[PDB]
Amino acid sequence: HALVFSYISFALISDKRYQKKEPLISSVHTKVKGIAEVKAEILENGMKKMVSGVFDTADYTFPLQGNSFFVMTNFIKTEGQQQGLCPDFPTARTICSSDRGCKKGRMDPQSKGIQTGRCVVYKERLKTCEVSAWCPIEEVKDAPRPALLNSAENFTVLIKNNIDFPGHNYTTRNITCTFHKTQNPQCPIFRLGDIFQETGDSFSDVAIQGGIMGIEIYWDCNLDGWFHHCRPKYSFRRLDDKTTYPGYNFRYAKYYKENNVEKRTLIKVFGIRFDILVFGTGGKFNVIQLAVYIGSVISYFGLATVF
Amino acid sequence: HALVFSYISFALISDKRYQKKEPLISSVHTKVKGIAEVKAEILENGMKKMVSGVFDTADYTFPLQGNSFFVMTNFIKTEGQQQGLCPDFPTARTICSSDRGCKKGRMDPQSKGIQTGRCVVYKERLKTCEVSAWCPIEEVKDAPRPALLNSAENFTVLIKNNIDFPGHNYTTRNITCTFHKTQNPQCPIFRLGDIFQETGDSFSDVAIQGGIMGIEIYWDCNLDGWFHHCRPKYSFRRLDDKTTYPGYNFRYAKYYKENNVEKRTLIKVFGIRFDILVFGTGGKFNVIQLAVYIGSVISYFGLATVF
Amino acid sequence: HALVFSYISFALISDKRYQKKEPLISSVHTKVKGIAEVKAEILENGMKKMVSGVFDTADYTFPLQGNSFFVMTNFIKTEGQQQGLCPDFPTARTICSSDRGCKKGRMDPQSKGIQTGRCVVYKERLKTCEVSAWCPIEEVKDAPRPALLNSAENFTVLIKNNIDFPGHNYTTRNITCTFHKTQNPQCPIFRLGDIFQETGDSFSDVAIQGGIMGIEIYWDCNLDGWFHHCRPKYSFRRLDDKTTYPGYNFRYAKYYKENNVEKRTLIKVFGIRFDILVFGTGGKFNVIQLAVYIGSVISYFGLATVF
Ligand SMILES: *[C@@H]1O[C@H](CO)[C@@H](O[C@@H]2O[C@H](CO)[C@@H](O)[C@H](O)[C@H]2NC(C)=O)[C@H](O)[C@H]1NC(C)=O
Ligand SMILES: *[C@@H]1O[C@H](CO)[C@@H](O[C@@H]2O[C@H](CO)[C@@H](O)[C@H](O)[C@H]2NC(C)=O)[C@H](O)[C@H]1NC(C)=O
Ligand SMILES: *[C@@H]1O[C@H](CO)[C@@H](O[C@@H]2O[C@H](CO)[C@@H](O)[C@H](O)[C@H]2NC(C)=O)[C@H](O)[C@H]1NC(C)=O
Ligand SMILES: C[C@@H](N/C(=N/c1cccc2ncccc12)NC#N)c1ccccc1
Ligand SMILES: C[C@@H](N/C(=N/c1cccc2ncccc12)NC#N)c1ccccc1
Ligand SMILES: C[C@@H](N/C(=N/c1cccc2ncccc12)NC#N)c1ccccc1
């Protein structure tokens, strides 16, 4: 009888059933900090090309969208594209053996053009299907072995989170320093390399193909006057698949007119997209809850006494 | 007495009250696949114009923002706009009868310019209020009868969802094939026409004015060791109003300098915006929950025996 | 005994425990309305400059991302930037006393360039560290005293919210008029000045540095056939910090080629970002819930009779 009561009180205190539970409504704002300089040479379209320059903050990041920001880590540039007819890039399914090899008015899913039914020569007696689209088509090329945005990990991000709860009627807002698991857990500025070290994923390896990382924030807050604890817990987990179109990459174009001719530049962007997740639990003691718990435990105690 | 107990156990098993319930934290990544070629001629500004060309993946879509992507289906192009003074486009409230007809320093909500108080001639003794803004103003014109992006329905979208739960400490990640309601429900690649066929909304009709469609995912997962079921359920529903500024459309500009003169191109974009929604329910059996349910049913059984 | 029963029924009716509770899944679409004309003169780079013109809808706003839109209120323009070497802008940590004062191959966090280790003269015997990046670097300059987008408050925004619930199997969709707290609470068109008047924050003061505002919507809906109440409640709260890199601002660039030379224009954007939040509570009466509540109150009544 007494043991059932002590265990009921201990379980109720451990689960905190007397305090009312409610979700948290958060609004996040992020500011990217740090710049990187790319000075690597990679051949393009059969010709060796040298790339050099520095990327400002606005060059490698977008504004926060849906409580999540993106950061570039690698890219493939294609300049001078203009609508027209050209032979498709050589692929396992793009090479044509004869003129009538390909089908007219057909567009493959992987191909970025609609075939006109003509077998043309891309380079030196190598025939692919004549396609109608942005010419020339971007070459199928793996991400560069060294991630162009090598200095991306040394970057530091600033995350400001505003918490609001309807029942509480309060809003909680979350020196230059880098967040550390134990030394400095309060610093809201994070080093990407520190995050990937938290998740155990190589930043240099992921930056080549791209990735999707998210920052999880847990709130174990209780509105009780006695034990008032409300501190943001920072947990990190990788959303990308790892094993592996893996990583994060999309086609982004910039259109310009040259010599009275419409032109477009297609850029394949590989990067890491961070999703800021805010999950919290609020608990403001309510008399009805305590009365319900007591009412439920009373029967258990009585049955324990009956045996 | 016995019937009340059997009904209590049957109801508890049907509602699954013994298993702990928790929400699901998801992160979605989408990749658009497919291209369309537009070769339609539509008159513009009183002159017949011919439009032809193919649109790549980067041309008709944006990067995923807020777990939702947008896909263009129709557009109205306006080129050569530059700041200055010009007569407003003829409308029910823009035509001026006399010079002093319009008010100086006034800007109507529907109008995109601030009137200077001068009644000018747009074309052939037709007078509208002189306005200061991007000139010339884009003409009020209905969406083209045939949706320019006819081939949009044949497109295929790839959706990858990563599920994470705090109490479970696990992450679940969700061949070229098209998803089917019964034949192939596992294929994560979707044909837009298949979605609109699921919702029963004509794609060709909606593409003209634009629309907002969302993909709902339901999770009826249970963490119990006995019955372990965790499969993503795909439900589809149209968020747009249908009846009807209906549809989805926004003004998107691209600024270029020509002949040492600042210029801007205004494009009215009509398209369908897909919102990926992830709703799930987790249930990991907890002793406290079962004890609470039993404690609540005990009183009901006793009262049933008392009668 | 009787008082405990009457109080139990009154408390159950007040808390509405018999009705099933469920969250709400919303999809929001926003359309910005109104235009502003900027005709202010502010000196730039030691030279007085005059700015004049009108901004269309597409100029000061982006498409809705993550159920939240952004509206510009102030900006700093920097034109002609091109990659190269140049002296950094004079700052407390950028001025070099001697040639060997600065460290080679070092980039400060606040600085947007990587120092080459050379002490150069920015203007008249004033030495800063030679940096490699976008040249010339944007000058450190406070936001203009008068917010360039003065007419932003007079703007009107249209918000359309679609509500969906899985258990209810229904979708609820939410004349030109401005929403008022009491006169016209149904008008879905909002005047920004009206919002900031609701939150008590000066719009003219915030527009200079920028801000983050959110529109909260509460749903106290009950699916009971007797008392069927389901009306959207509009509550407003400011997410920005106020006290204070405060406000909302980001670097946004536009790249153009001039005289066969790659060039970029960096624009520091200050604005207010509105986050549309949808929180609701659904309640469809369930027999199991009522039976549970009654079972929990029965023990309390019996104990009250025992005394
Ligand atoms: C990130 O910062 C670290 C220093 O905190 C850099 O490490 C140095 O790298 C240089 C070569 O660039 C070496 O000469 C130094 O010996 C390194 N020092 C340390 C302590 O590691 C690192 O190179 C930076 N990474 C990037 C991509 O810029
Ligand atoms: C989408 O694909 C279907 C085929 O799966 C196309 O249907 C064909 O259309 C052509 C005309 O372009 C007809 O000659 C064929 O007879 C059609 N076949 C079938 C099976 O429908 C359809 O035209 C495509 N739609 C778009 C907009 O490209
Ligand atoms: C917003 O609209 C109000 C009117 O509703 C404007 O107020 C007028 O401002 C002009 C000067 O531009 C004065 O001559 C009038 O006397 C004002 N009238 C009233 C009733 O206030 C206000 O200027 C507008 N604000 C902006 C930034 O355009
Ligand atoms: C804003 C844009 N950044 C861009 N940065 C470059 C600046 C100079 C030269 C470049 N060359 C190749 C590639 C990039 C650049 N260029 C564009 N557009 C971007 C960033 C992240 C993801 C997509 C797009
Ligand atoms: C990225 C952009 N796509 C664009 N595609 C075109 C490419 C060539 C010619 C065009 N002509 C008219 C209209 C479009 C185009 N042009 C721009 N900007 C876009 C896509 C979807 C929604 C808004 C904006
Ligand atoms: C789309 C863009 N608006 C822009 N509007 C201008 C139009 C003409 C002259 C300008 N001069 C200075 C500054 C702006 C402008 N220009 C660009 N890019 C924008 C809007 C809001 C936030 C970021 C970016």
Side-chain angles (χ1 to χ4, degrees), chain A residues 2 9 11 15 18 23-30 32 34-36 38 40 42 46-47 50-64 66-76 78-92 94-99 101-102 105 109 111 113 115-117 119-122 124 126 128-144 146-157 162 166-167 169 177-180 182-185 187-208 210-215 217 219 221 225 230 232 234-236 240 242 245-253 255-256 261-262 265-272 274-278 280-283 291 295 302 304, chain B residues 2 9 11 15 18 23-30 32 34-36 38 40 42 46-47 50-64 66-76 78-92 94-99 101-102 105 109 111 113 115-117 119-122 124 126 128-144 146-157 162 166-167 169 177-180 182-185 187-208 210-215 217 219 221 225 230 232 234-236 240 242 245-253 255-256 261-262 265-272 274-278 280-283 291 295 302 304, chain C residues 2 9 11 15 18 23-30 32 34-36 38 40 42 46-47 50-64 66-76 78-92 94-99 101-102 105 109 111 113 115-117 119-122 124 126 128-144 146-157 162 166-167 169 177-180 182-185 187-208 210-215 217 219 221 225 230 232 234-236 240 242 245-253 255-256 261-262 265-272 274-278 280-283 291 295 302 304:
Chain A
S9 179
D15 208 336
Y18 60 98
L24 198 174
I25 301 181
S26 61
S27 177
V28 186
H29 167 43
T30 62
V32 184
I35 73 176
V38 174
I42 304 296
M47 283 304 307
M50 167 59 70
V51 177
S52 60
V54 184
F55 296 154
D56 61 61
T57 297
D59 284 337
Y60 61 78
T61 190
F62 288 13
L64 188 78
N67 301 25
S68 58
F69 57 86
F70 163 84
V71 179
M72 175 184 295
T73 76
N74 202 335
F75 63 84
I76 296 181
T78 303
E79 303 176 355
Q81 268 191 335
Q82 67 174 88
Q83 284 194 344
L85 303 180
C86 51
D88 194 325
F89 187 76
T91 315
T94 61
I95 296 185
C96 55
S97 301
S98 60
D99 184 8
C102 321
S111 180
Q115 301 180 5
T116 55
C119 184
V120 290
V121 291
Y122 192 170
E124 292 303 54
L126 185 47
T128 50
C129 310
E130 170 181 329
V131 304
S132 174
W134 298 108
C135 290
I137 306 179
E138 56 172 332
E139 55 171 321
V140 174
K141 172 185 178 182
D142 289 356
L148 294 184
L149 273 35
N150 49 23
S151 303
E153 67 160 333
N154 279 345
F155 293 166
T156 65
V157 59
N162 183 11
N169 185 20
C177 55
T178 296
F179 156 83
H180 195 269
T182 60
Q183 283 187 331
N184 291 318
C187 297
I189 312 305
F190 299 84
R191 172 182 173 269
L192 309 187
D194 302 1
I195 291 183
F196 280 148
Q197 287 189 358
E198 289 290 347
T199 180
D201 296 59
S202 175
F203 171 86
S204 302
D205 188 8
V206 173
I208 308 175
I212 304 177
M213 242 296 303
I215 298 180
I217 298 181
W219 297 84
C221 299
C230 200
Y234 291 77
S235 59
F236 301 76
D240 60 324
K242 300 183 185 181
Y245 259 99
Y248 210 69
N249 68 325
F250 49 74
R251 294 183 178 178
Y252 184 94
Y255 318 112
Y256 63 86
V261 177
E262 186 81 1
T265 288
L266 219 68
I267 291 182
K268 184 169 294 297
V269 179
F270 315 85
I272 310 176
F274 293 71
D275 295 2
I276 293 184
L277 307 180
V278 183
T281 303
Chain B
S9 179
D15 208 336
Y18 60 98
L24 198 174
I25 301 181
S26 61
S27 177
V28 186
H29 167 43
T30 62
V32 184
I35 73 176
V38 174
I42 304 296
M47 283 304 307
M50 167 59 70
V51 177
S52 60
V54 184
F55 296 154
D56 61 61
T57 297
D59 284 337
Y60 61 78
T61 190
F62 288 13
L64 188 78
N67 301 25
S68 58
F69 57 86
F70 163 84
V71 179
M72 175 184 295
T73 76
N74 202 335
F75 63 84
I76 296 181
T78 303
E79 303 176 355
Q81 268 191 335
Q82 67 174 88
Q83 284 194 344
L85 303 180
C86 51
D88 194 325
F89 187 76
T91 315
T94 61
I95 296 185
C96 55
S97 301
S98 60
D99 184 8
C102 321
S111 180
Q115 301 180 5
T116 55
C119 184
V120 290
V121 291
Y122 192 170
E124 292 303 54
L126 185 47
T128 50
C129 310
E130 170 181 329
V131 304
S132 174
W134 298 108
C135 290
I137 306 179
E138 56 172 332
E139 55 171 321
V140 174
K141 172 185 178 182
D142 289 356
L148 294 184
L149 273 35
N150 49 23
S151 303
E153 67 160 333
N154 279 345
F155 293 166
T156 65
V157 59
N162 183 11
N169 185 20
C177 55
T178 296
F179 156 83
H180 195 269
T182 60
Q183 283 187 331
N184 291 318
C187 297
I189 312 305
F190 299 84
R191 172 182 173 269
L192 309 187
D194 302 1
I195 291 183
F196 280 148
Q197 287 189 358
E198 289 290 347
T199 180
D201 296 59
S202 175
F203 171 86
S204 302
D205 188 8
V206 173
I208 308 175
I212 304 177
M213 242 296 303
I215 298 180
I217 298 181
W219 297 84
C221 299
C230 200
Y234 291 77
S235 59
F236 301 76
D240 60 324
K242 300 183 185 181
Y245 259 99
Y248 210 69
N249 68 325
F250 49 74
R251 294 183 178 178
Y252 184 94
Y255 318 112
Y256 63 86
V261 177
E262 186 81 1
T265 288
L266 219 68
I267 291 182
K268 184 169 294 297
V269 179
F270 315 85
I272 310 176
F274 293 71
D275 295 2
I276 293 184
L277 307 180
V278 183
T281 303
Chain C
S9 179
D15 208 336
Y18 60 98
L24 198 174
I25 301 181
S26 61
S27 177
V28 186
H29 167 43
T30 62
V32 184
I35 73 176
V38 174
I42 304 296
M47 283 304 307
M50 167 59 70
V51 177
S52 60
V54 184
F55 296 154
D56 61 61
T57 297
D59 284 337
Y60 61 78
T61 190
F62 288 13
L64 188 78
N67 301 25
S68 58
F69 57 86
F70 163 84
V71 179
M72 175 184 295
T73 76
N74 202 335
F75 63 84
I76 296 181
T78 303
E79 303 176 355
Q81 268 191 335
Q82 67 174 88
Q83 284 194 344
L85 303 180
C86 51
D88 194 325
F89 187 76
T91 315
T94 61
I95 296 185
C96 55
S97 301
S98 60
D99 184 8
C102 321
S111 180
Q115 301 180 5
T116 55
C119 184
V120 290
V121 291
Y122 192 170
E124 292 303 54
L126 185 47
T128 50
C129 310
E130 170 181 329
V131 304
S132 174
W134 298 108
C135 290
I137 306 179
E138 56 172 332
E139 55 171 321
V140 174
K141 172 185 178 182
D142 289 356
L148 294 184
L149 273 35
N150 49 23
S151 303
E153 67 160 333
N154 279 345
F155 293 166
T156 65
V157 59
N162 183 11
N169 185 20
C177 55
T178 296
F179 156 83
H180 195 269
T182 60
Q183 283 187 331
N184 291 318
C187 297
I189 312 305
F190 299 84
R191 172 182 173 269
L192 309 187
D194 302 1
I195 291 183
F196 280 148
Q197 287 189 358
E198 289 290 347
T199 180
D201 296 59
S202 175
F203 171 86
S204 302
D205 188 8
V206 173
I208 308 175
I212 304 177
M213 242 296 303
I215 298 180
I217 298 181
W219 297 84
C221 299
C230 200
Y234 291 77
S235 59
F236 301 76
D240 60 324
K242 300 183 185 181
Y245 259 99
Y248 210 69
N249 68 325
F250 49 74
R251 294 183 178 178
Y252 184 94
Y255 318 112
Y256 63 86
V261 177
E262 186 81 1
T265 288
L266 219 68
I267 291 182
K268 184 169 294 297
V269 179
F270 315 85
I272 310 176
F274 293 71
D275 295 2
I276 293 184
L277 307 180
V278 183
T281 303

